[PDB]
Design a protein around this ligand. Structure first.
Ligand code: WXO
Length: 167
């Protein structure tokens, strides 16, 4: 039993809710919140901009130190940093950005990072400003992630479409 409330169960291990991931994180304080990161951990907009704003820019300060030490992430890769006031940990995961021409096949590799964590609160990778089809992203999630994933979808119209078209 865990503290996530109001989710629709899609599969044995995947759950979905129309929610603001920032507000969901603030209330649940999950062990892991997933950020929709880029390779530079520049959290300017989308999910990343919103998560970072909710930390009063502490996420960006920590991220800049990480990059200065380690260099950029790989597309499809991840790193674990602090969750600040939102979660114990933040798993920064880089899905491919279609608006930069990155290979959508890397979306499966991105979701594989979730399997290193027993339970996660997450957005749909490569959705939103990353330019992928969120229905495809949900399919890859379901077919790749084996751990327990609680997906927060900000847009109510999109959430209803994801549910109604789910196979
Ligand atoms: O404050 C915020 N809370 C959020 O949950 C959030 C989620 C996303 S999104 O890319 O995952 N997306 C989901 C796909 C398309 C619908 C529109 C949103 C972007 N910005 C956000 N800002």
């Amino acid at each position: 039993v865990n503290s996530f409330s109001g989710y629709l169960k899609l599969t044995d291990n995947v759950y979905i809710k129309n929610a603001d991931i920032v507000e969901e994180a603030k209330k649940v304080k999950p062990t892991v919140v997933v950020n929709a990161a880029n390779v530079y951990l520049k959290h300017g907009g989308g999910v990343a901009g919103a998560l970072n704003k909710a930390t009063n820019n502490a996420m960006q300060v920590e991220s800049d130190d990480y990059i200065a030490t380690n260099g950029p992430l790989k597309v499809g890769g991840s790193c674990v940093l602090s969750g600040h006031n939102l979660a114990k940990h933040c798993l920064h995961v880089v899905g491919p950005n279609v608006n930069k021409g990155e290979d959508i096949q890397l979306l499966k590799s991105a979701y594989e990072n979730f399997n290193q964590h027993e339970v996660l609160l997450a957005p749909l990778l490569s959705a939103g400003i990353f330019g992928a089809d969120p229905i495809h992203s949900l399919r890859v999630c379901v077919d790749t992630v084996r751990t327990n994933v609680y997906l927060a979808v900000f847009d109510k119209n999109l959430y209803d479409k994801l549910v109604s078209s789910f196979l």
